[PDB]
């Protein structure tokens, strides 16, 4: 039925501090995509942290079940091959790995190296670009089997067309049956999402659909 719910959620990082989230409400059905938008400091990553149990509500209720795969907004690499970085301790399957690689446009990068998927990262040899590290980090999160994918601004350092292509091939097509929360501000992502939550300084600036928002326009 419903995969993730927040109801009247208020939370604080620090006792007696200012609330980081204020009366937040949303629901995601199984297989849907929630886009979470808002300016820096609005509370988007903190919302993800609450779903992951790192931040408890002071008011309100939260529902979520099952395993989570989390993609940080800060890309990271550990010493090892590009294949090891993407599978990252999960069991290996050639078809699944290849599908993720292709959806993240990493096939083109990998094909250029003599060592192919065995190119070694994070050990002083290859220095990856920001966009390469972001696509590897996204691929790692998408390769993991999970009930809920939390993708925190995963398109760092990508030009707008590459971002659009990967949003479509990875988030929309490859992950079509999966419950997804994507922190993103881009118009097409909000338009393709089943629901949109725009945060501003902890509060719900807007919650609904892109179509509902368009209907409010003069
Ligand atoms: N005390 C404390 N404050 C935090 C922590 N993490 C985030 N914050 C603060 O909580 C507010 C929201 O922060 P975030 O949730 O990281 O904001 P965001 O929407 O993810 O911002 P961007 O990632 O820059 O787009 C901010 O005012 C932060 O200063 C923490 O671990 N401890
Ligand atoms: Mg953040």
Q: What is the rounded CA–CA span in Å between residue 191 and residue 186?
A: 9
In the chain, the domains with their CATH numbers are 1-218 (3.40.50.300)
Does the annotation flag 73 for ligand binding? yes
Cα(91) to ligand 2 centroid in Å equals 30
Which of 15, 24, 40, 41 is the best mutation target for the ligand 1 pocket, counting ligand atoms within 8 Å of the beta carbon and taking the most? 41
Q: Which two tokens stand for residue 194?
A: 């089943």
Question: 166 by DSSP, 3-state: which?
Answer: helix
Angstrom distance (rounded) from CA 19 to CA 60: 13
User: In this structure, are residues 109 and 131 in contact, taking their beta carbons and an 8 Å threshold?
Assistant: no
CA 10 to chain centroid: 22
Q: Is 18 annotated as a binding residue?
A: no
Ligand 1 pocket, 46 CB below 6 A?
yes
Q: Judge whether 122 and 78 are in contact, CB under 8 Å.
A: yes
In terms of Cα–Cα distance, which of 165, 141, 26 is closest to 75?
Answer: 141
Length of the chain in terms of residues written:
218
| Residue 43 marked in a binding site | yes
Q: Which run of H or of E encompasses 17? A: none
Q: Is the CB of 12 under 6 A from ligand 1?
A: no
Q: Which token pair is 206?
A: 């807007």
Residues within 5 A (CB) of ion ligand 2: 45, 73
Query: How many whole angstroms separate alpha carbon 209 and alpha carbon 196?
Result: 6
CA distances from 171 to 14, 182, 206 (A): 34, 9, 22
Ligand nearest the Cα of residue 54 is: 1
- Report the C-alpha gap between 167 and 71 in whole angstroms: 14
Please tell me whether 204 is known to bind a ligand: no
Q: Which two tokens stand for residue 86?
A: 């993407």
CA of 111 to the centre of ligand 2 (A): 32
DSSP state for residue 6 in the 8-state scheme: E
């Amino acid at each position: 039925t419903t995969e993730v719910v927040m109801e009247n959620v208020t939370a604080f990082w620090e006792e007696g501090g200012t609330p980081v989230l204020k009366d937040i409400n949303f629901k995601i059905e199984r297989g849907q995509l929630l886009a979470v938008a808002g300016s820096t400091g609005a509370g988007k990553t903190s919302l993800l942290m609450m779903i992951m149990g790192e931040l408890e509500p002071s008011e309100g209720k939260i529902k979520h079940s099952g395993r989570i795969s989390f993609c940080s907004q800060f890309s990271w690499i550990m010493p090892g091959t590009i294949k090891e970085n993407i599978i990252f301790g999960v069991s290996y399957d050639e078809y699944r790995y290849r599908s993720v690689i292709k959806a993240c446009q990493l096939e083109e990068d990998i094909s250029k190296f003599a060592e192919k998927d065995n190119i070694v990262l994070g050990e002083g040899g290859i220095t990856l670009s920001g966009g390469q590290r972001a696509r590897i980090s996204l691929a790692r999160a998408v390769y993991k089997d999970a009930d809920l994918y939390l993708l925190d601004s995963p398109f760092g350092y990508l030009d707008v067309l590459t971002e659009k292509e990967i949003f479509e091939s990875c988030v929309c097509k490859l992950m079509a049956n999966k419950t997804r929360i994507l922190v993103t501000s881009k118009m097409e992502h909000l338009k393709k999402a089943d629901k949109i939550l725009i945060l501003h300084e902890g509060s719900s600036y807007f919650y609904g659909t892109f179509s509902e928002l368009q209907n409010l326009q003069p």
